[PDB]
Design a protein around this ligand. Structure first.
Ligand SMILES: O=c1[nH]c2cc(C(F)(F)F)c(N3CCOCC3)cc2n(CP(=O)(O)O)c1=O
Ligand SMILES: CCCCCCCCCCCCCCCC
Ligand SMILES: CCCCCCCCCC
Ligand SMILES: CCCCCCCCC
Ligand SMILES: CCCCCCCC
Lengths: 47, 101, 51, 98
């Protein structure tokens, strides 16, 4: 796998509500989160 | 700025200004164009094999109109006050009725 | 660095001017309240003198 | 002498080298051929060994970055709108109701 870093205090990556129900990267939601998913889908690598 | 009521003009970046205007109670607005020109970008350790295909994926997403869709969704489709009266009401030169009510 | 996926710039943020709904008696603005009252008191004064 | 000329003069200052302001004989940009599958213009000149650098407003994209490593854009373009200046129109009839 790969280790990916980002900042939290920004409208790009935010902690979605009900984070206790989710776990891992699924809890983090935001514009920058969708960009990371599309790039990982195009390149083809888990992260 | 919200308390000055037309007395304090804060100078910040374009993306943060558009988000604080739309995704917040819109008592302030952005006026004028950008003074300087900057640009964001994802990084990669110096001398790594994850720079070529990553750069090609970024240009592919920006060419297929995907980044413009994601921006219009998180900045406009999810604003706090929304877009009330999206059609900008032109400044009527005629005298209103409330002025002589 | 990769190619810039988003462009930006130093922008200006000012308070959005409200609609500024004029008052009900906005037509009494060109003349002060002291003028309107002095006109009424001069109106009744001229009438009594004329009588 | 223009914008790209001054840009190349400033780039050659921070990166000392010998350069000649050559002009492309085709006057076109990077366009993939239908059947020949060969480039043209500045991309065709750089892919076949005709110039050392291209100080020109080349629109970066996916079809060109795979063959020519671009740099950070010195300026951003935009599909803008142009219209005639809003001059005073001819005042028609019933203009006293304004
Ligand atoms: O890399 C490119 N850079 C370009 C730069 C310019 C400009 F800088 F504005 F001169 C223009 N023009 C805009 C209108 O037509 C006349 C000249 C075209 C360009 N094109 C062709 P396009 O892709 O069809 O737009 C490119 O390919
Ligand atoms: C003596 C009394 C004078 C009263 C003047 C009132 C003027 C109010 C102007 C604004 C009205 C808004 C409803
Ligand atoms: C401004 C409050 C008083 C307005 C008086 C208007 C009088 C009009 C007739 C003289
Ligand atoms: C500015 C021209 C207006 C013309 C209105 C004609 C109405 C006819 C009933
Ligand atoms: C407060 C002013 C009242 C005026 C009433 C009308 C007088 C002619």
């Amino acid at each position: 796998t790969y280790i990916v870093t980002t900042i939290l205090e920004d409208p790009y990556v935010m902690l979605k509500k009900n984070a206790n129900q989710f776990e891992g990267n699924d809890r983090y939601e935001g514009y920058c989160v969708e960009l990371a998913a599309e790039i990982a889908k195009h390149v083809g690598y888990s992260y | 700025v919200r308390k000055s009521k037309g007395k304090y003009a804060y100078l910040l970046e374009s993306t943060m200004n558009e988000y604080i205007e739309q995704r917040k109670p819109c008592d302030t607005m952005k006026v004028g164009g950008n003074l300087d020109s900057k640009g964001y970008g994802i990084a990669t350790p110096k001398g790594s094999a994850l720079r070529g295909p990553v750069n090609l994926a970024v240009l592919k997403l920006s060419e297929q109109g995907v980044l413009d869709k994601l921006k219009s969704k998180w900045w406009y489709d999810k604003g706090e006050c929304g877009s009330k009266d999206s059609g900008s009401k032109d400044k009527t030169s005629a005298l209103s009725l409330s002025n002589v009510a | 660095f990769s190619k810039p996926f988003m462009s930006l710039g130093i922008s200006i943020m000012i308070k959005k001017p409200q609609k500024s709904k004029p008052g009900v008696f906005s037509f009494l603005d060109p003349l002060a309240y002291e003028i309107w009252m002095c006109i009424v008191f001069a109106y009744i004064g001229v009438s009594v003198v004329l009588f | 002498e223009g914008y790209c000329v001054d840009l190349a003069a400033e780039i050659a200052k921070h990166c000392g080298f010998k350069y000649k302001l050559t002009i492309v004989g085709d006057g076109k940009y990077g366009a993939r051929d239908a059947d020949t599958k060969i480039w043209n213009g500045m991309v065709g000149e750089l892919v076949y060994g005709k110039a050392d650098i291209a100080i020109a407003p080349l629109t970066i994209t996916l079809v060109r970055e795979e063959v020519i490593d671009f740099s950070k854009p010195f300026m951003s373009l935009g599909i803008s709108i142009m219209i005639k200046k809003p001059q005073k129109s001819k005042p028609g009839v019933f203009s006293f109701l304004d």
